Design an enzyme around this catalytic site. Sequence first.
Site, mmCIF file in Angstrom:
data_model
loop_
_atom_site.group_PDB
_atom_site.id
_atom_site.type_symbol
_atom_site.label_atom_id
_atom_site.label_comp_id
_atom_site.label_asym_id
_atom_site.label_seq_id
_atom_site.Cartn_x
_atom_site.Cartn_y
_atom_site.Cartn_z
ATOM 1 N N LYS A 103 38.814 37.770 95.227
ATOM 2 C CA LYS A 103 38.400 36.548 94.553
ATOM 3 C C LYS A 103 38.985 36.526 93.152
ATOM 4 C CE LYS A 103 36.306 32.906 95.826
ATOM 5 N NZ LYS A 103 36.076 32.335 97.178
ATOM 6 N N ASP A 143 40.431 26.975 95.768
ATOM 7 C CA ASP A 143 38.977 26.966 95.667
ATOM 8 C C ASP A 143 38.517 25.800 94.803
ATOM 9 O OD1 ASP A 143 36.498 27.812 96.381
ATOM 10 O OD2 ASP A 143 36.674 29.816 95.517
#
Length: 417
Positions: A103, A143
């Site tokens: 991430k 994202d």
Amino acid sequence: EIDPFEMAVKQLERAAQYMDISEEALEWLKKPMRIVEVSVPIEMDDGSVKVFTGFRVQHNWARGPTKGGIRWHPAETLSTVKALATWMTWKVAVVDLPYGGGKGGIIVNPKELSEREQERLARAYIRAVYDVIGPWTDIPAPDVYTNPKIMGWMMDEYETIMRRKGPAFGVITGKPLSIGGSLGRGTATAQGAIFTIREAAKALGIDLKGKKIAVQGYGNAGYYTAKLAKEQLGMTVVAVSDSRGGIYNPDGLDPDEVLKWKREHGSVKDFPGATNITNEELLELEVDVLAPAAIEEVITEKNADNIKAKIVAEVANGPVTPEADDILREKGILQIPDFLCNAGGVTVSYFEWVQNINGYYWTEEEVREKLDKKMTKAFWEVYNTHKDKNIHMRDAAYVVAVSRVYQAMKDRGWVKK
Ligand SMILES: NC(=O)C1=CN([C@@H]2O[C@H](COP(=O)(O)OP(=O)(O)OC[C@H]3O[C@@H](n4cnc5c(N)ncnc54)[C@H](OP(=O)(O)O)[C@@H]3O)[C@@H](O)[C@H]2O)C=CC1
């Protein structure tokens, strides 16, 4: 205030409580294997220089290169990035991908940045985190507040730094079709949800042809879920909703017309021939498939009992609370876990990475069939664990993912027990 990483660790411990895992493996899994925090300096349009905080957390890479998106939110925190990387680990493990968990994030408000400033931000982030990313090390993805345009900019910067010594297309996914993009990325989540719903109906022995489905949230995921359900599964769409409200029609809805009306009236409300209903009222309808594709925590302990759906497809990211989970399981209702139902997006990103690595690109049918196979296998594994261990479907999915990661760790020799 319930720190995200604390929540993730608690979830992991809960999952470990339902399976045989050593203490050393649990301790290893409770901590990200590598966290990189870097300064991201860019030149503003007024000629000034501003420094932003960027993150890149690689939770675990026992199963392969880590996979995860990059968030551009003003409220980004290292704790949130770590928790999302931990969740991405299980997300890629449950659907059997050769990936780990990763991430990224930059603490920035992108609404106040111009196109040139956003491109500079993407290129500077790549320059900062180049040493810990790669086609076989870490593959970023779109994202929140990040789009394929930023993916293209990041890929171009990575290729410039790498001097074209390998598959620079495969360093990042979600790219435009012109540069290493993949087909089927638009409808990945909805397609995976449809395959999981079909498999759930097969497991329950219910023929979906002629049944009713209600979808909460009519964005990309919700609209495509309704459309694909009506097209492939032959299920009558009787209710859809947006932030403003919802509509109901027992005779059926046409998703294309509803989308047209939403894109013309700004909302799905007041659709001709449809009765206006509230979101809460949509959760109350007697249907056979319910697909919450909207805000988190729409099913709580208050309204868990009053749900009449046979199958609840958690298309969104955790629309059911644990108390609601227990109540719904007690009512004999099958739940499809959130990180298994919407695993189509990450699976299609993996397909894109495979296409980039191989240098050969597939078509819409091949992607659709491979996704079908992956989702069917993942759902069947989770359901078999659910039936064998007599636990919740969410717990079964967590057990499957953690077992896969633990086996990969044991095979590498990382943990001896
Ligand atoms: N779509 C994807 O590619 C993937 C989706 N997900 C998950 O899926 C869900 C939807 O994805 P996505 O299509 O991108 O979302 P979108 O932003 O495209 O659309 C959101 C939809 O949900 C509605 N909505 C937002 N808040 C509420 C609310 N409180 N009550 C009722 N409806 C609400 C919006 O209404 P309105 O239009 O009026 O604003 C809109 O219809 C999310 O939960 C997300 O986390 C994650 C994996 C990838």
